[PDB]
Each structure stands twice: as C-alpha cells, then as structure tokens.
Design an enzyme around this catalytic site. Structure first.
Site, PDB file in Angstrom:
ATOM      1  N   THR B  11       0.547  -0.900   0.233  1.00  0.00           N
ATOM      2  CA  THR B  11       0.119  -0.019  -0.092  1.00  0.00           C
ATOM      3  C   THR B  11       0.555   1.154  -0.085  1.00  0.00           C
ATOM      4  O   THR B  11       2.377   0.936   0.538  1.00  0.00           O
ATOM      5  CB  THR B  11      -0.633   0.252   1.241  1.00  0.00           C
ATOM      6  N   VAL B  13       2.594   2.541  -2.152  1.00  0.00           N
ATOM      7  CA  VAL B  13       4.052   2.572  -3.559  1.00  0.00           C
ATOM      8  C   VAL B  13       3.920   3.711  -4.396  1.00  0.00           C
ATOM      9  O   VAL B  13       4.982   3.619  -4.958  1.00  0.00           O
ATOM     10  CB  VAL B  13       4.388   1.153  -3.782  1.00  0.00           C
ATOM     11  N   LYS B  37     -10.132   1.787 -12.290  1.00  0.00           N
ATOM     12  CA  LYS B  37     -10.020   1.533 -10.922  1.00  0.00           C
ATOM     13  C   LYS B  37     -11.147   0.743 -10.556  1.00  0.00           C
ATOM     14  O   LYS B  37     -12.211   1.223 -10.533  1.00  0.00           O
ATOM     15  CB  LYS B  37      -9.641   2.765 -10.236  1.00  0.00           C
ATOM     16  N   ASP B  49      -8.922   7.712  -6.719  1.00  0.00           N
ATOM     17  CA  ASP B  49      -7.642   7.783  -7.749  1.00  0.00           C
ATOM     18  C   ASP B  49      -8.095   8.173  -9.219  1.00  0.00           C
ATOM     19  O   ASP B  49      -7.104   9.062  -9.817  1.00  0.00           O
ATOM     20  CB  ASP B  49      -7.067   6.309  -7.534  1.00  0.00           C
ATOM     21  N   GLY B 169       7.741   4.137  -7.496  1.00  0.00           N
ATOM     22  CA  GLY B 169       6.845   4.849  -7.754  1.00  0.00           C
ATOM     23  C   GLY B 169       6.936   6.324  -6.929  1.00  0.00           C
ATOM     24  O   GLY B 169       6.725   6.950  -7.771  1.00  0.00           O
TER      25      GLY B 169
END
Ligand SMILES: Nc1ccn([C@@H]2O[C@H](COP(=O)(O)OP(=O)(O)OP(=O)(O)O)[C@@H](O)[C@H]2O)c(=O)n1
Lengths: 225, 225
Positions: B11, B13, B37, B49, B169
């Site tokens: 989570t 990242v 998503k 997101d 990331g």
C-alpha cells in the site's frame, strides 16, 4: 529434532520478538530451545537479534554465522564491507549442528522469505527445504498485510515448505477497525498461532515470560516436539 | 489493443501516480489512454484515484464500478458496508470494453496483487489472466523492496502473467545508501522502466507532463501500442 524457520512478511514485523516469545513459551513447557541467526545485518547500528532473544527470553543457546555492519539486504551489506555471503551449505551446517531430538530449533531469517542469504539467490525457503523445516510466518495487523501474507504463503507452497502458522508480531491496544478485520481475515488464510501485544520488548523477564505463555496455545507448543 | 495491469508491492507505493505518469507519457506519444479502477476504497476521506489520474495526466476515459467509504481492503470495506464486491464478470468486461486498438488501457488494483477485488475471491491476478494483460509492478526503493518485488513477480509467474516491468513509485532525494543499492538490485530482477521523483503527485498538470515524458524511455512507451 524439530526445526522451525521463523520468517516474516517484511522487515520489522517482529520476527525477533516472536522468536523470543516462542522460545520462552517452549522453555516454559520444558522444551529445550536453540535460536539461530545465520545472517545478521546492521551490527554497526548495534543490531543483534540473538542478543535480544537472550535478553528477552533467557535463551542461552544462540548461534550466529554471518555478521554485516550496514543495515541493508545481506548482499548489499556484505558487498559494502568487502565481505561475501555465506554458502548455502554453510547455513545448513549451522542449523544441523543445533538440531537434535527433543529440541525446538528456531531459525530467524533476515527480512522477508525471499531475501538473499547465500549466492546465487539462495533464500530462507531453500534453507527450509534442506533442513525440512516448517515455517512460522510473522505478520502485521496493518493495511497491506493480507497481500503480503498470501504472497509469502504462496511462495512457501511453491517449494512444499509447510506453514506452521501465522503470528501477529505486534497487536495494538485497542485494535482499530482495520486491525480487527485483518485479524479475522488472516485467521481464514491460516492458523493464527498468537498475537503479541505491542511493545512486548519493553517487558522485563517475568512480564515477558508471562506474556509469552499467555500468547500461544499450550497444546500447539507442546506438540511442536 | 493493449491492456496493462498496474499493481504494487504494497500500500502507498504510488500506483496511482505511476498510472498517471505512464498515461501522461503515452498521451504525449500520441497514444489514447484509458484508466480503469474497478474498486475504489476510502471515499469517506476523499480517496479518488481516478480523479488524480484526470488532474495529472488529463485522461478522460476513467471507469469505475464501486466506491466503498471505509479506508480498507475492498472485501473488508464491502463487508463493513454490507454490500458485495462487484462480480468477476463486471470487472473483466468493463476492462474488455475499454480495450480498443490504438489505446493503452491501464487497470489499477486496490493495494497489492492478491487483494480480493471481486466475488468470489477474484484478485487482480485472475483479472490479468482473463483479459490477457501484462503486469506493471510498482515498487519502493526502501529496505524490504527486494523481498516484496520477488514475491510479486513469483506470484505473477505462477499464473503465467507476464511482467511489463518495474517502476519505483517514489525516488527519494537525496537517495541514500539503501535506495541507491536497491535501484541497482531491482534492475537485476526486472526491467526498471522508470523511477518517479518523490513528491511528483503534488505537481500541476504541465509540470507532471514534463516529468512524465522524462521518466520513461520513449521507445518503450511508443512500442506499448
Ligand atoms: N510485540 C512486539 C513486536 C515488536 N516490538 C518492537 O518492534 C520492533 C520490531 O521487532 P523485531 O522483532 O526486531 O522486527 P523483525 O521482524 O525481527 O525485523 P528484522 O528483519 O530487522 O530482524 C523491535 O524494535 C521490537 O522491539 C515490540 O516492541 N513488541
């Protein structure tokens, strides 16, 4: 002669405190315990998990092999000190010399299951296969743990390394919605052997021993050996 | 008609920022982009997101199925909400309908690769198999990333989902000893397509565009579709 490899879903999930807790529980059941740390990184920052098990649980049989100054993955730590990783058979010999009937031998890895302990690409999982250990998997109660746990369990089944169960290394008080839910879900993925309370390493000798014996189902621990 | 599953080693990242950055680079190469998503959690505190992808990369074909208010893993968020995750069929055909020649279709999961997305037990991995997507893995630069990446790659391989590569990331500044070692080490495991600078998510569109166009090798992007 029971060998148990203590791995985790990550670095810093409480592998070392679980080792001490499990060692303490086993010793309280009259089971002889040796704890083994074949790869120890971060010694220059003062990290020494065998010393912590000893301090926490009173274990005297502590066995080390490779020690690297920097707090890194073993390969990086080694290459930084101009040192080499130990051989796969070197790690297996160490554990084998500890192994004997009646004794619970705990082998704490470095970080997660697929961290490189020996070249080329030798990991705790390979080691587990060679000594026929089962694996105890230490997990967090935090968001992300279900994925990490499922990945680690899959990785384990891939070389037929049995899973001895899960231990939640650090369990908050009070637990939040997310922590509570994750426990229930983790328990569906595998047997949850114990959930150690947050900050257990702050406990003194007796408090730790008391915690440890409360933490594990006594029939599970007795039945390890 | 290229579909690309974007997943993470955990989570936070930076999966979303990597979707946006690839979408942005792809658009500047003349490729049409869709991001999907299917399950979005944590809406009660504004997690969206798809909106971030819209703001950073200007993508307009942003598709979703479910929004659960609790900041949890889908299945848990759904059970808290008392409403099932979408059916397997819903996610696969959404993605299938998005897909079209000349277009990069990015699919973003919820957390990591074995997080349950649909009923029953359908994970992002199953989805990738069903729509025949390659998988892009978002990783960190932090201690523990080699383990997490290897576990994710192994899981992908176990169902024959090809790996499109890795992306860090969030690349720290300054990098420090661990991150520098890890970037080299991840490259030994899989292609490193890009490492996004820490803080890129706060960039305005124009700046984000310029960063993105520099973050990926243009050939690799061009050759995606
Ligand atoms: N129930 C717990 C669990 C963990 N700890 C503390 O949290 C940290 C993480 O525990 P540790 O066992 O050292 O993590 P490991 O998984 O062993 O990490 P490593 O790979 O470095 O050995 C330690 O400082 C430990 O003292 C604690 O206070 N009580």
């Amino acid at each position: 002669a029971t060998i148990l490899v203590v791995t985790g879903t990550g670095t810093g999930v409480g592998k070392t405190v679980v080792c001490a807790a499990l060692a303490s529980a086993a010793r309280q059941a009259g089971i002889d315990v040796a704890v083994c740390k074949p790869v120890q990184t971060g010694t220059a920052r003062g990290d020494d998990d065998l010393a912590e098990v000893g301090r926490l649980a009173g274990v005297t049989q502590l066995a080390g092999l490779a020690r690297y100054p920097q707090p890194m993955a073993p390969a990086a730590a080694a290459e930084h000190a101009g040192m080499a990783l130990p051989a796969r058979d070197q790690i297996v010999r160490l554990i084998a010399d500890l192994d004997r009937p009646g004794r619970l031998t705990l082998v704490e890895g470095a970080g997660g299951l697929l961290v490189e302990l020996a070249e080329p690409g030798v990991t705790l999982r390979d080691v587990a296969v060679d000594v026929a250990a089962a694996a105890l998997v230490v997990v967090t109660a935090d968001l992300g743990t279900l994925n990490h746990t499922k990945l680690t369990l899959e990785a384990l089944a891939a070389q037929q390394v049995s899973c001895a169960g899960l231990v939640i290394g650090s369990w908050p008080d009070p637990p939040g919605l997310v922590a509570a839910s994750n426990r229930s879900a983790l328990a569906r993925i595998a047997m949850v052997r114990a959930a150690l309370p947050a900050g257990a390493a702050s406990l003194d000798a007796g408090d730790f021993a008391a915690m440890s014996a409360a933490a594990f189902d006594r029939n599970w621990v007795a039945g390890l050996v």
